[PDB]
Structures are given as structure tokens and as C-alpha cells.
Amino acid sequence: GPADCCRMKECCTDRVNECLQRYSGREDKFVSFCYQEATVTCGSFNEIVGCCYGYQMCMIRVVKPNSLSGAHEACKTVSCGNPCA
Amino acid sequence: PADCCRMKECCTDRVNECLQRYSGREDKFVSFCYQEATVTCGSFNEIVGCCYGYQMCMIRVVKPNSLSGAHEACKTVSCGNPCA
């Protein structure tokens, strides 16, 4: 149950990044898994949407094996979209 | 493309700028300026507005001629649920 949507976003992108850092060499295959993990820990206002949906979509588009950091740096500021639906 | 961080920053900036027009009477204009900020920055629920926690914080803290301190105190406060 997040108290603030922006804090939720910051938490979201940090946690996804760290999680994907655990999956080095296969990061692209774990973007969704790590996003779900981040949604549980950081919370969400709609669990279907999660803690930052635009970031998940960006990372799915961009993340390649052993290339995590550039993808995260590029995607972390993208608009999350509507947290409600 | 909406973003709640950008929305929050827009919200508090716009409320502050709006209240800067009402020097000496800021306390009476907090809600007005929050409506102005909500229209300008957008919201995910128009009744809730662009940052509800900030509105309530400013209602509590803003006194005549002390706007900047109030804004500084309130601008990082939790917005609450943007949806309802």
C-alpha cells in the first residue's frame, strides 16, 4: 500500500534494476519477473498495472543480455502512465 | 504520456506559483491554487487532484506572508492515493 506514487516509481525502477542485476546474462527474460517482484515490494495502486508500467514496457523493448545498465538508465525516467488503470 | 512524479513536481510548483499571486492572503487561496494546479498539471482523479497530501499539508501549514517556508515544508510530503 504505497503512500506516494512518485516514491512508488523510484522504488520500482531501483528494485527492477537490482533484481535484474541478479539475473546477469539473461536480463531480458527476467524483466517481467523482476517487475512483479518490484510491484509486490514497492506496492501499487492497481496490481495489474504495477509500480511503473511504462518502465516495464521500456525495459522489455530495450534490455538485452549483459547490457542492463544502459537500458535502465534510458528507461528509468520514461513516463509510467496511469497508476490507476 | 502521464507520469506521477512529473505530475507531483508540476503540482507543487504550480500551487506555489499560484499562491505567489496572493501575497498576504495565501491561506485563503490554497484550495483555489490547488484547483489551478490540478487543471494545469492534470490528475488521475480530478476530485483528488494532482497531489492531495500536498494540498492538505499546505492547508495546515500556509499562513499569511510565510508561503515559501510552507512550500518548502510540504513539497516532499506523500501525495496519497491518486486514484481515489
Q: B76 is written with which cell numbers?
A: 516532499
Q: How far apart are CA B48 and CA B65, in angstroms?
A: 27
Experiment used for this model: X-ray
Characterize B39-54 residue by residue with b for buried, 16 or more Cβ atoms within 10 angstroms of its Cβ, and e for exposed. Answer: eebbbbeeebbbbbbb
3-state helix vs strand vs coil in chain A, percent to 5: 60, 0, 40
Cβ neighbours around B84 below 10 Å, total: 10
Cell 482523479 belongs to: B45
Cell 494546479 belongs to: B37
- Alpha carbon B27 to its chain centroid, in Å, reads 12
Please give the angle made by the CA atoms of B44, B9 and A61, to the nearest 5 degrees.
Answer: 70
Q: Give the helix ranges, DSSP H, for chain B.
A: 4-19, 26-41, 52-61, 67-74
Indicate yes or no: CB of A83 within 8 angstroms of CB of B4. Answer: yes
Indicate yes or no: CB of A5 within 8 angstroms of CB of B5. Answer: yes
CA-nearest of A45, A48, A78, A14 to B5 is A78
Whether B50 contacts B8, CB under 8 Å = yes
User: Which helix (H) or strand (E) element contains residue B22?
Assistant: none
Positions of chain breaks in chain A, given as the residue before each break (C to N > 2.5 Å): none
- Classify domain A1-85 by CATH architecture: Up-down Bundle (1.20)
Indicate yes or no: CB of A80 within 8 angstroms of CB of B2. Answer: yes
- Classify domain B1-84 by CATH architecture: Up-down Bundle (1.20)
Chain A partners of B1 at a C-beta cutoff of 8 Å? 54, 79, 81
Q: A83 is written with which cell numbers?
A: 497508476
CA-nearest of A59, A60, A52 to A75 is A59
Those residues whose C-beta lies under 8 Å from the C-beta of residue A73, and which sit 6 or more positions away, are: none
Cβ neighbours around A1 below 10 Å, total: 6
Whether A5 contacts chain B with CB within 8 A: yes
- Alpha carbon B40 to its chain centroid, in Å, reads 11
Indicate yes or no: CB of A5 within 8 angstroms of CB of B45. Answer: no
Chain B partners of A51 at a C-beta cutoff of 8 Å? none
- Alpha carbon B2 to its chain centroid, in Å, reads 18
Q: How far apart are CA A37 and CA A66, in angstroms?
A: 21
Q: How far apart are CA B4 and CA A65, in angstroms?
A: 30
